[PDB]
PDB file of C-alpha atoms in Angstrom:
ATOM      1  CA  UNK X   1     -97.265 148.868 -23.185  1.00  0.00           C
ATOM      2  CA  UNK X   2     -95.241 147.682 -20.151  1.00  0.00           C
ATOM      3  CA  UNK X   3     -97.423 147.621 -17.009  1.00  0.00           C
ATOM      4  CA  UNK X   4     -94.440 149.041 -15.169  1.00  0.00           C
ATOM      5  CA  UNK X   5     -94.104 151.798 -17.817  1.00  0.00           C
ATOM      6  CA  UNK X   6     -97.835 152.444 -17.700  1.00  0.00           C
ATOM      7  CA  UNK X   7     -97.518 153.068 -13.961  1.00  0.00           C
ATOM      8  CA  UNK X   8     -94.520 155.351 -14.457  1.00  0.00           C
ATOM      9  CA  UNK X   9     -96.370 157.505 -16.984  1.00  0.00           C
ATOM     10  CA  UNK X  10     -99.465 157.726 -14.726  1.00  0.00           C
ATOM     11  CA  UNK X  11     -97.463 158.739 -11.678  1.00  0.00           C
ATOM     12  CA  UNK X  12     -95.365 161.095 -13.763  1.00  0.00           C
ATOM     13  CA  UNK X  13     -98.306 162.932 -15.325  1.00  0.00           C
ATOM     14  CA  UNK X  14    -100.322 163.094 -12.064  1.00  0.00           C
ATOM     15  CA  UNK X  15     -97.275 164.047  -9.966  1.00  0.00           C
ATOM     16  CA  UNK X  16     -98.034 167.713 -10.649  1.00  0.00           C
ATOM     17  CA  UNK X  17    -101.764 167.185 -10.133  1.00  0.00           C
ATOM     18  CA  UNK X  18    -103.683 167.474  -6.882  1.00  0.00           C
ATOM     19  CA  UNK X  19    -105.139 164.023  -6.259  1.00  0.00           C
ATOM     20  CA  UNK X  20    -106.992 163.250  -3.047  1.00  0.00           C
ATOM     21  CA  UNK X  21    -105.003 160.865  -0.817  1.00  0.00           C
ATOM     22  CA  UNK X  22    -107.359 157.913  -1.435  1.00  0.00           C
ATOM     23  CA  UNK X  23    -106.892 157.859  -5.201  1.00  0.00           C
ATOM     24  CA  UNK X  24    -105.017 154.750  -6.318  1.00  0.00           C
ATOM     25  CA  UNK X  25    -103.880 154.825  -9.913  1.00  0.00           C
ATOM     26  CA  UNK X  26    -103.315 151.067  -9.792  1.00  0.00           C
ATOM     27  CA  UNK X  27    -107.041 150.717 -10.475  1.00  0.00           C
ATOM     28  CA  UNK X  28    -106.236 152.040 -13.990  1.00  0.00           C
ATOM     29  CA  UNK X  29    -102.745 150.698 -14.475  1.00  0.00           C
ATOM     30  CA  UNK X  30    -104.113 147.215 -13.784  1.00  0.00           C
ATOM     31  CA  UNK X  31    -106.803 147.301 -16.443  1.00  0.00           C
ATOM     32  CA  UNK X  32    -106.502 145.020 -19.482  1.00  0.00           C
ATOM     33  CA  UNK X  33    -107.130 147.669 -22.183  1.00  0.00           C
ATOM     34  CA  UNK X  34    -104.144 148.272 -24.420  1.00  0.00           C
ATOM     35  CA  UNK X  35    -103.621 152.025 -24.180  1.00  0.00           C
ATOM     36  CA  UNK X  36    -101.035 154.495 -25.450  1.00  0.00           C
ATOM     37  CA  UNK X  37     -98.848 156.963 -23.628  1.00  0.00           C
ATOM     38  CA  UNK X  38    -101.104 159.590 -25.232  1.00  0.00           C
ATOM     39  CA  UNK X  39    -104.267 158.016 -23.796  1.00  0.00           C
ATOM     40  CA  UNK X  40    -102.802 158.105 -20.286  1.00  0.00           C
ATOM     41  CA  UNK X  41    -101.993 161.767 -20.840  1.00  0.00           C
ATOM     42  CA  UNK X  42    -105.535 162.408 -22.044  1.00  0.00           C
ATOM     43  CA  UNK X  43    -107.033 160.395 -19.214  1.00  0.00           C
ATOM     44  CA  UNK X  44    -105.058 162.565 -16.819  1.00  0.00           C
ATOM     45  CA  UNK X  45    -106.021 165.860 -18.488  1.00  0.00           C
ATOM     46  CA  UNK X  46    -109.680 164.848 -18.732  1.00  0.00           C
ATOM     47  CA  UNK X  47    -109.592 164.011 -14.993  1.00  0.00           C
ATOM     48  CA  UNK X  48    -108.404 167.496 -14.103  1.00  0.00           C
ATOM     49  CA  UNK X  49    -111.089 168.978 -16.354  1.00  0.00           C
ATOM     50  CA  UNK X  50    -113.842 166.879 -14.726  1.00  0.00           C
ATOM     51  CA  UNK X  51    -112.610 168.095 -11.349  1.00  0.00           C
ATOM     52  CA  UNK X  52    -112.844 171.715 -12.565  1.00  0.00           C
ATOM     53  CA  UNK X  53    -116.416 171.073 -13.759  1.00  0.00           C
ATOM     54  CA  UNK X  54    -117.301 170.509 -10.075  1.00  0.00           C
ATOM     55  CA  UNK X  55    -115.406 173.667  -9.004  1.00  0.00           C
ATOM     56  CA  UNK X  56    -113.279 171.193  -7.118  1.00  0.00           C
ATOM     57  CA  UNK X  57    -109.494 171.756  -6.967  1.00  0.00           C
ATOM     58  CA  UNK X  58    -108.805 168.201  -5.755  1.00  0.00           C
ATOM     59  CA  UNK X  59    -109.073 165.289  -8.262  1.00  0.00           C
ATOM     60  CA  UNK X  60    -111.058 162.212  -7.170  1.00  0.00           C
ATOM     61  CA  UNK X  61    -111.315 158.561  -8.036  1.00  0.00           C
ATOM     62  CA  UNK X  62    -114.567 159.349  -9.864  1.00  0.00           C
ATOM     63  CA  UNK X  63    -112.795 161.790 -12.158  1.00  0.00           C
ATOM     64  CA  UNK X  64    -110.378 159.059 -13.171  1.00  0.00           C
ATOM     65  CA  UNK X  65    -113.080 156.426 -13.698  1.00  0.00           C
ATOM     66  CA  UNK X  66    -114.923 158.932 -15.821  1.00  0.00           C
ATOM     67  CA  UNK X  67    -111.955 160.101 -17.847  1.00  0.00           C
ATOM     68  CA  UNK X  68    -110.741 156.533 -18.391  1.00  0.00           C
ATOM     69  CA  UNK X  69    -114.084 155.575 -19.875  1.00  0.00           C
ATOM     70  CA  UNK X  70    -114.175 158.692 -22.080  1.00  0.00           C
ATOM     71  CA  UNK X  71    -110.678 158.338 -23.575  1.00  0.00           C
ATOM     72  CA  UNK X  72    -110.544 154.587 -23.889  1.00  0.00           C
ATOM     73  CA  UNK X  73    -113.218 154.281 -26.547  1.00  0.00           C
TER      74      UNK X  73
ATOM     75  CA  UNK I   3    -109.505 175.211  -0.324  1.00  0.00           C
ATOM     76  CA  UNK I   4    -112.986 174.161  -1.386  1.00  0.00           C
ATOM     77  CA  UNK I   5    -113.411 170.561  -2.411  1.00  0.00           C
ATOM     78  CA  UNK I   6    -117.201 170.403  -1.997  1.00  0.00           C
ATOM     79  CA  UNK I   7    -120.331 172.446  -2.720  1.00  0.00           C
ATOM     80  CA  UNK I   8    -121.538 171.970   0.867  1.00  0.00           C
ATOM     81  CA  UNK I   9    -119.779 174.134   3.448  1.00  0.00           C
ATOM     82  CA  UNK I  10    -119.810 171.552   6.228  1.00  0.00           C
ATOM     83  CA  UNK I  11    -117.831 169.261   3.938  1.00  0.00           C
ATOM     84  CA  UNK I  12    -115.244 171.912   3.168  1.00  0.00           C
ATOM     85  CA  UNK I  13    -114.955 172.443   6.927  1.00  0.00           C
ATOM     86  CA  UNK I  14    -114.563 168.691   7.415  1.00  0.00           C
ATOM     87  CA  UNK I  15    -111.751 168.446   4.815  1.00  0.00           C
ATOM     88  CA  UNK I  16    -109.975 171.610   5.938  1.00  0.00           C
ATOM     89  CA  UNK I  17    -109.869 170.332   9.511  1.00  0.00           C
ATOM     90  CA  UNK I  18    -111.871 173.239  10.996  1.00  0.00           C
ATOM     91  CA  UNK I  19    -112.755 171.159  14.071  1.00  0.00           C
ATOM     92  CA  UNK I  20    -114.257 173.854  16.301  1.00  0.00           C
ATOM     93  CA  UNK I  21    -116.413 175.413  13.576  1.00  0.00           C
ATOM     94  CA  UNK I  22    -117.593 171.972  12.494  1.00  0.00           C
ATOM     95  CA  UNK I  23    -118.546 170.856  16.006  1.00  0.00           C
ATOM     96  CA  UNK I  24    -120.246 174.217  16.563  1.00  0.00           C
ATOM     97  CA  UNK I  25    -122.421 174.219  13.445  1.00  0.00           C
ATOM     98  CA  UNK I  26    -123.314 170.579  13.773  1.00  0.00           C
ATOM     99  CA  UNK I  27    -124.224 170.876  17.439  1.00  0.00           C
ATOM    100  CA  UNK I  28    -126.717 173.572  16.388  1.00  0.00           C
ATOM    101  CA  UNK I  29    -128.030 171.698  13.327  1.00  0.00           C
ATOM    102  CA  UNK I  30    -127.480 167.951  13.747  1.00  0.00           C
ATOM    103  CA  UNK I  31    -128.724 167.301  10.209  1.00  0.00           C
ATOM    104  CA  UNK I  32    -125.490 168.855   8.873  1.00  0.00           C
ATOM    105  CA  UNK I  33    -123.603 165.768  10.075  1.00  0.00           C
ATOM    106  CA  UNK I  34    -125.248 163.704   7.332  1.00  0.00           C
ATOM    107  CA  UNK I  35    -125.810 166.303   4.626  1.00  0.00           C
ATOM    108  CA  UNK I  36    -124.637 164.946   1.228  1.00  0.00           C
ATOM    109  CA  UNK I  37    -122.659 166.914  -1.357  1.00  0.00           C
ATOM    110  CA  UNK I  38    -122.399 166.687  -5.125  1.00  0.00           C
ATOM    111  CA  UNK I  39    -120.317 163.511  -4.701  1.00  0.00           C
ATOM    112  CA  UNK I  40    -122.751 161.801  -2.374  1.00  0.00           C
ATOM    113  CA  UNK I  41    -120.181 162.473   0.298  1.00  0.00           C
ATOM    114  CA  UNK I  42    -120.782 163.771   3.825  1.00  0.00           C
ATOM    115  CA  UNK I  43    -118.388 165.262   6.363  1.00  0.00           C
ATOM    116  CA  UNK I  44    -117.202 161.717   7.256  1.00  0.00           C
ATOM    117  CA  UNK I  45    -115.941 160.842   3.760  1.00  0.00           C
ATOM    118  CA  UNK I  46    -114.086 164.101   3.565  1.00  0.00           C
ATOM    119  CA  UNK I  47    -112.658 163.908   7.078  1.00  0.00           C
ATOM    120  CA  UNK I  48    -111.395 160.409   6.357  1.00  0.00           C
ATOM    121  CA  UNK I  49    -109.749 161.548   3.170  1.00  0.00           C
ATOM    122  CA  UNK I  50    -107.834 164.422   4.812  1.00  0.00           C
ATOM    123  CA  UNK I  51    -107.008 162.349   7.871  1.00  0.00           C
ATOM    124  CA  UNK I  52    -108.637 164.500  10.582  1.00  0.00           C
ATOM    125  CA  UNK I  53    -109.039 161.870  13.303  1.00  0.00           C
ATOM    126  CA  UNK I  54    -110.732 164.196  15.798  1.00  0.00           C
ATOM    127  CA  UNK I  55    -113.445 165.256  13.349  1.00  0.00           C
ATOM    128  CA  UNK I  56    -114.104 161.631  12.505  1.00  0.00           C
ATOM    129  CA  UNK I  57    -114.336 160.721  16.217  1.00  0.00           C
ATOM    130  CA  UNK I  58    -116.810 163.532  16.819  1.00  0.00           C
ATOM    131  CA  UNK I  59    -118.971 162.312  13.937  1.00  0.00           C
ATOM    132  CA  UNK I  60    -118.853 158.695  15.086  1.00  0.00           C
ATOM    133  CA  UNK I  61    -119.704 159.528  18.720  1.00  0.00           C
ATOM    134  CA  UNK I  62    -122.598 161.481  17.240  1.00  0.00           C
ATOM    135  CA  UNK I  63    -123.778 158.206  15.714  1.00  0.00           C
ATOM    136  CA  UNK I  64    -123.574 158.981  11.991  1.00  0.00           C
ATOM    137  CA  UNK I  65    -123.831 155.966   9.661  1.00  0.00           C
ATOM    138  CA  UNK I  66    -120.350 154.553   8.835  1.00  0.00           C
ATOM    139  CA  UNK I  67    -121.037 152.484   5.730  1.00  0.00           C
ATOM    140  CA  UNK I  68    -122.688 154.927   3.320  1.00  0.00           C
ATOM    141  CA  UNK I  69    -120.811 154.864  -0.015  1.00  0.00           C
ATOM    142  CA  UNK I  70    -120.114 157.985  -2.095  1.00  0.00           C
ATOM    143  CA  UNK I  71    -121.133 158.163  -5.753  1.00  0.00           C
ATOM    144  CA  UNK I  72    -118.083 156.199  -6.825  1.00  0.00           C
ATOM    145  CA  UNK I  73    -119.065 153.494  -4.322  1.00  0.00           C
ATOM    146  CA  UNK I  74    -116.332 154.412  -1.822  1.00  0.00           C
ATOM    147  CA  UNK I  75    -117.314 153.890   1.835  1.00  0.00           C
ATOM    148  CA  UNK I  76    -115.492 155.814   4.601  1.00  0.00           C
ATOM    149  CA  UNK I  77    -113.393 152.653   5.252  1.00  0.00           C
ATOM    150  CA  UNK I  78    -112.293 152.545   1.581  1.00  0.00           C
ATOM    151  CA  UNK I  79    -111.221 156.172   1.846  1.00  0.00           C
ATOM    152  CA  UNK I  80    -109.448 155.888   5.204  1.00  0.00           C
ATOM    153  CA  UNK I  81    -107.740 152.609   4.304  1.00  0.00           C
ATOM    154  CA  UNK I  82    -106.497 153.956   0.992  1.00  0.00           C
ATOM    155  CA  UNK I  83    -105.367 157.326   2.319  1.00  0.00           C
ATOM    156  CA  UNK I  84    -103.461 155.399   4.982  1.00  0.00           C
ATOM    157  CA  UNK I  85    -105.286 156.743   8.051  1.00  0.00           C
ATOM    158  CA  UNK I  86    -104.636 154.062  10.724  1.00  0.00           C
ATOM    159  CA  UNK I  87    -106.355 155.642  13.726  1.00  0.00           C
ATOM    160  CA  UNK I  88    -109.432 156.460  11.664  1.00  0.00           C
ATOM    161  CA  UNK I  89    -109.491 152.983  10.238  1.00  0.00           C
ATOM    162  CA  UNK I  90    -109.444 151.532  13.749  1.00  0.00           C
ATOM    163  CA  UNK I  91    -112.217 153.862  14.895  1.00  0.00           C
ATOM    164  CA  UNK I  92    -114.308 152.891  11.860  1.00  0.00           C
ATOM    165  CA  UNK I  93    -113.951 149.155  12.552  1.00  0.00           C
ATOM    166  CA  UNK I  94    -115.091 149.473  16.205  1.00  0.00           C
ATOM    167  CA  UNK I  95    -118.123 151.306  14.869  1.00  0.00           C
ATOM    168  CA  UNK I  96    -119.117 148.498  12.484  1.00  0.00           C
ATOM    169  CA  UNK I  97    -117.615 149.545   9.157  1.00  0.00           C
ATOM    170  CA  UNK I  98    -118.012 146.795   6.543  1.00  0.00           C
ATOM    171  CA  UNK I  99    -114.636 145.176   5.803  1.00  0.00           C
ATOM    172  CA  UNK I 100    -115.708 143.540   2.578  1.00  0.00           C
ATOM    173  CA  UNK I 101    -117.657 146.437   1.066  1.00  0.00           C
ATOM    174  CA  UNK I 102    -116.964 147.020  -2.647  1.00  0.00           C
ATOM    175  CA  UNK I 103    -116.856 150.249  -4.625  1.00  0.00           C
ATOM    176  CA  UNK I 104    -117.668 150.744  -8.303  1.00  0.00           C
ATOM    177  CA  UNK I 105    -114.691 148.728  -9.427  1.00  0.00           C
ATOM    178  CA  UNK I 106    -115.190 145.767  -7.122  1.00  0.00           C
ATOM    179  CA  UNK I 107    -112.409 146.690  -4.734  1.00  0.00           C
ATOM    180  CA  UNK I 108    -112.640 146.200  -1.022  1.00  0.00           C
ATOM    181  CA  UNK I 109    -110.727 148.437   1.338  1.00  0.00           C
ATOM    182  CA  UNK I 110    -108.070 145.678   1.456  1.00  0.00           C
ATOM    183  CA  UNK I 111    -107.289 146.144  -2.283  1.00  0.00           C
ATOM    184  CA  UNK I 112    -106.211 149.702  -1.595  1.00  0.00           C
ATOM    185  CA  UNK I 113    -104.344 149.049   1.658  1.00  0.00           C
ATOM    186  CA  UNK I 114    -102.306 146.406  -0.131  1.00  0.00           C
ATOM    187  CA  UNK I 115    -101.709 148.349  -3.326  1.00  0.00           C
ATOM    188  CA  UNK I 116    -100.483 151.362  -1.355  1.00  0.00           C
ATOM    189  CA  UNK I 117     -98.327 149.686   1.287  1.00  0.00           C
ATOM    190  CA  UNK I 118    -100.634 150.328   4.242  1.00  0.00           C
ATOM    191  CA  UNK I 119     -99.230 147.441   6.297  1.00  0.00           C
ATOM    192  CA  UNK I 120    -100.711 148.185   9.696  1.00  0.00           C
ATOM    193  CA  UNK I 121    -104.103 148.933   8.053  1.00  0.00           C
ATOM    194  CA  UNK I 122    -104.031 145.652   6.081  1.00  0.00           C
ATOM    195  CA  UNK I 123    -103.488 143.738   9.312  1.00  0.00           C
ATOM    196  CA  UNK I 124    -106.435 145.526  11.001  1.00  0.00           C
ATOM    197  CA  UNK I 125    -108.650 144.757   8.009  1.00  0.00           C
ATOM    198  CA  UNK I 126    -107.565 141.139   7.951  1.00  0.00           C
ATOM    199  CA  UNK I 127    -107.933 140.774  11.735  1.00  0.00           C
ATOM    200  CA  UNK I 128    -111.351 142.359  11.142  1.00  0.00           C
ATOM    201  CA  UNK I 129    -112.621 139.580   8.871  1.00  0.00           C
ATOM    202  CA  UNK I 130    -111.417 140.887   5.488  1.00  0.00           C
ATOM    203  CA  UNK I 131    -111.654 138.311   2.732  1.00  0.00           C
ATOM    204  CA  UNK I 132    -108.091 137.975   1.441  1.00  0.00           C
ATOM    205  CA  UNK I 133    -109.272 136.586  -1.866  1.00  0.00           C
ATOM    206  CA  UNK I 134    -111.829 139.271  -2.690  1.00  0.00           C
ATOM    207  CA  UNK I 135    -111.747 139.836  -6.436  1.00  0.00           C
ATOM    208  CA  UNK I 136    -112.359 143.166  -8.134  1.00  0.00           C
ATOM    209  CA  UNK I 137    -114.256 143.633 -11.410  1.00  0.00           C
ATOM    210  CA  UNK I 138    -111.248 142.388 -13.348  1.00  0.00           C
ATOM    211  CA  UNK I 139    -110.889 139.396 -11.061  1.00  0.00           C
ATOM    212  CA  UNK I 140    -107.791 140.863  -9.361  1.00  0.00           C
ATOM    213  CA  UNK I 141    -107.014 140.413  -5.671  1.00  0.00           C
ATOM    214  CA  UNK I 142    -105.116 142.418  -3.081  1.00  0.00           C
ATOM    215  CA  UNK I 143    -102.165 140.092  -3.794  1.00  0.00           C
ATOM    216  CA  UNK I 144    -102.162 140.954  -7.534  1.00  0.00           C
ATOM    217  CA  UNK I 145    -101.697 144.606  -6.639  1.00  0.00           C
ATOM    218  CA  UNK I 146     -98.986 144.039  -4.022  1.00  0.00           C
ATOM    219  CA  UNK I 147     -97.027 141.595  -6.160  1.00  0.00           C
ATOM    220  CA  UNK I 148     -97.190 143.749  -9.284  1.00  0.00           C
ATOM    221  CA  UNK I 149     -95.954 146.848  -7.439  1.00  0.00           C
ATOM    222  CA  UNK I 150     -93.115 145.202  -5.514  1.00  0.00           C
ATOM    223  CA  UNK I 151     -94.700 145.464  -2.043  1.00  0.00           C
ATOM    224  CA  UNK I 152     -92.750 142.592  -0.466  1.00  0.00           C
ATOM    225  CA  UNK I 153     -93.849 142.895   3.178  1.00  0.00           C
ATOM    226  CA  UNK I 154     -97.451 143.262   2.073  1.00  0.00           C
ATOM    227  CA  UNK I 155     -97.105 140.052   0.054  1.00  0.00           C
ATOM    228  CA  UNK I 156     -95.872 138.390   3.269  1.00  0.00           C
ATOM    229  CA  UNK I 157     -98.863 139.682   5.221  1.00  0.00           C
ATOM    230  CA  UNK I 158    -101.426 138.440   2.693  1.00  0.00           C
ATOM    231  CA  UNK I 159     -99.882 134.956   2.454  1.00  0.00           C
ATOM    232  CA  UNK I 160     -99.683 134.856   6.254  1.00  0.00           C
ATOM    233  CA  UNK I 161    -103.443 135.428   6.380  1.00  0.00           C
ATOM    234  CA  UNK I 162    -103.811 132.607   3.868  1.00  0.00           C
ATOM    235  CA  UNK I 163    -104.520 134.563   0.680  1.00  0.00           C
ATOM    236  CA  UNK I 164    -104.613 132.198  -2.319  1.00  0.00           C
ATOM    237  CA  UNK I 165    -101.733 132.653  -4.753  1.00  0.00           C
ATOM    238  CA  UNK I 166    -103.284 131.092  -7.837  1.00  0.00           C
ATOM    239  CA  UNK I 167    -106.350 133.237  -8.491  1.00  0.00           C
ATOM    240  CA  UNK I 168    -106.370 134.430 -12.123  1.00  0.00           C
ATOM    241  CA  UNK I 169    -107.529 137.894 -13.230  1.00  0.00           C
ATOM    242  CA  UNK I 170    -109.331 138.528 -16.520  1.00  0.00           C
ATOM    243  CA  UNK I 171    -106.048 138.256 -18.436  1.00  0.00           C
ATOM    244  CA  UNK I 172    -105.443 134.873 -16.860  1.00  0.00           C
ATOM    245  CA  UNK I 173    -102.623 136.209 -14.692  1.00  0.00           C
ATOM    246  CA  UNK I 174    -101.902 135.101 -11.140  1.00  0.00           C
ATOM    247  CA  UNK I 175     -99.868 137.363  -8.796  1.00  0.00           C
ATOM    248  CA  UNK I 176     -96.685 135.443  -9.684  1.00  0.00           C
ATOM    249  CA  UNK I 177     -97.302 136.285 -13.370  1.00  0.00           C
ATOM    250  CA  UNK I 178     -97.354 139.956 -12.347  1.00  0.00           C
ATOM    251  CA  UNK I 179     -94.374 139.739 -10.063  1.00  0.00           C
ATOM    252  CA  UNK I 180     -92.502 138.033 -12.882  1.00  0.00           C
ATOM    253  CA  UNK I 181     -93.494 140.428 -15.618  1.00  0.00           C
ATOM    254  CA  UNK I 182     -92.364 143.397 -13.545  1.00  0.00           C
ATOM    255  CA  UNK I 183     -89.205 141.668 -12.348  1.00  0.00           C
ATOM    256  CA  UNK I 184     -90.173 141.718  -8.646  1.00  0.00           C
ATOM    257  CA  UNK I 185     -87.519 139.133  -7.738  1.00  0.00           C
ATOM    258  CA  UNK I 186     -87.961 138.694  -4.010  1.00  0.00           C
ATOM    259  CA  UNK I 187     -91.755 138.771  -4.475  1.00  0.00           C
ATOM    260  CA  UNK I 188     -91.689 136.032  -7.096  1.00  0.00           C
ATOM    261  CA  UNK I 189     -89.271 133.884  -5.084  1.00  0.00           C
ATOM    262  CA  UNK I 190     -91.351 134.292  -1.925  1.00  0.00           C
ATOM    263  CA  UNK I 191     -94.521 133.407  -3.857  1.00  0.00           C
ATOM    264  CA  UNK I 192     -93.005 130.234  -5.304  1.00  0.00           C
ATOM    265  CA  UNK I 193     -91.466 129.291  -1.954  1.00  0.00           C
ATOM    266  CA  UNK I 194     -94.945 129.863  -0.558  1.00  0.00           C
ATOM    267  CA  UNK I 195     -96.531 127.548  -3.129  1.00  0.00           C
ATOM    268  CA  UNK I 196     -97.544 129.749  -6.060  1.00  0.00           C
ATOM    269  CA  UNK I 197     -97.659 127.724  -9.283  1.00  0.00           C
ATOM    270  CA  UNK I 198     -95.010 128.342 -11.959  1.00  0.00           C
ATOM    271  CA  UNK I 199     -97.184 126.275 -14.299  1.00  0.00           C
ATOM    272  CA  UNK I 200    -100.422 128.246 -14.831  1.00  0.00           C
ATOM    273  CA  UNK I 201    -100.791 129.591 -18.380  1.00  0.00           C
ATOM    274  CA  UNK I 202    -102.441 133.011 -18.645  1.00  0.00           C
ATOM    275  CA  UNK I 203    -104.700 133.955 -21.565  1.00  0.00           C
ATOM    276  CA  UNK I 204    -101.738 134.470 -23.898  1.00  0.00           C
ATOM    277  CA  UNK I 205    -100.935 130.866 -22.873  1.00  0.00           C
ATOM    278  CA  UNK I 206     -97.748 131.946 -21.078  1.00  0.00           C
ATOM    279  CA  UNK I 207     -96.713 130.595 -17.658  1.00  0.00           C
ATOM    280  CA  UNK I 208     -95.052 132.862 -15.066  1.00  0.00           C
ATOM    281  CA  UNK I 209     -91.698 131.503 -16.234  1.00  0.00           C
ATOM    282  CA  UNK I 210     -92.229 132.618 -19.835  1.00  0.00           C
ATOM    283  CA  UNK I 211     -93.194 136.018 -18.585  1.00  0.00           C
ATOM    284  CA  UNK I 212     -90.037 136.528 -16.519  1.00  0.00           C
ATOM    285  CA  UNK I 213     -86.473 137.524 -17.335  1.00  0.00           C
ATOM    286  CA  UNK I 214     -84.559 134.515 -18.613  1.00  0.00           C
ATOM    287  CA  UNK I 215     -82.583 134.142 -15.370  1.00  0.00           C
ATOM    288  CA  UNK I 216     -85.519 134.836 -13.053  1.00  0.00           C
ATOM    289  CA  UNK I 217     -87.382 132.018 -14.806  1.00  0.00           C
ATOM    290  CA  UNK I 218     -84.554 129.554 -14.151  1.00  0.00           C
ATOM    291  CA  UNK I 219     -84.368 130.610 -10.489  1.00  0.00           C
ATOM    292  CA  UNK I 220     -88.086 130.140  -9.865  1.00  0.00           C
ATOM    293  CA  UNK I 221     -87.895 126.834 -11.782  1.00  0.00           C
ATOM    294  CA  UNK I 222     -85.235 125.574  -9.360  1.00  0.00           C
ATOM    295  CA  UNK I 223     -87.093 126.851  -6.286  1.00  0.00           C
ATOM    296  CA  UNK I 224     -90.379 125.266  -7.381  1.00  0.00           C
ATOM    297  CA  UNK I 225     -88.738 121.887  -7.883  1.00  0.00           C
ATOM    298  CA  UNK I 226     -87.092 122.349  -4.499  1.00  0.00           C
ATOM    299  CA  UNK I 227     -90.536 122.637  -2.902  1.00  0.00           C
ATOM    300  CA  UNK I 228     -91.680 119.619  -4.899  1.00  0.00           C
ATOM    301  CA  UNK I 229     -88.722 117.427  -3.900  1.00  0.00           C
ATOM    302  CA  UNK I 230     -89.162 117.995  -0.165  1.00  0.00           C
ATOM    303  CA  UNK I 231     -92.692 117.117   0.950  1.00  0.00           C
TER     304      UNK I 231
END
């Protein structure tokens, strides 16, 4: 999908999430993998879940790296 | 509100300056105690932007280049979270400007992606490699151009960043500016020498990737730069 659209969906879904200030979604938006709007939604949900697994209420870059890898294949 | 399993780190993030100084002055080892994310009080203080806490730690002599489990050094965190003062403090203390995290990014990739102008300049004045490539072969300029960060694109070119580096998809920053219709970015890149001729991996040039009209504008501007000089 559109790289611009991909960014919009990521910022839209994570707009209600509590990301640490250093997280930069462009690391994911910029990847070459062709992913669906559903995958971005799953990546985002999986990130929140991984945060919860660490009893952490803030989501980190590591949660996103992790979730991205899990969802995308 | 509890971001770590180690209390001193929660104190660091929550900005509890007096308690932090107090506990650490009693047990100096707390200053470098690692949490479940391979983070210490420094990483967390940088993230939240508590300059004072960071200064205390640095005067104490804590290491400034230790990376967390995702490979993020305190400078990556501060730069990204847009903490100017902290970034400055870190540089005086020897923070590594070209350190990479798990995805190959240097602190400059983040400063540029997130419009941290002043920080980008400090990093660049500090020896930052403008052409550092991440694990997908993308540079700070790819991020700035793609997102429409005009002034940041100026800053990178002005510190001589190369405009024709191709990422794993074969795209240069102009390709990205074009594909996302970042008009002024694209025009500035071509006026600054970016090539309108490089085919990416889908064998498309920046022109073919842009809006019909945008392509014709860049075409004209590129030939203008050719003509003169």
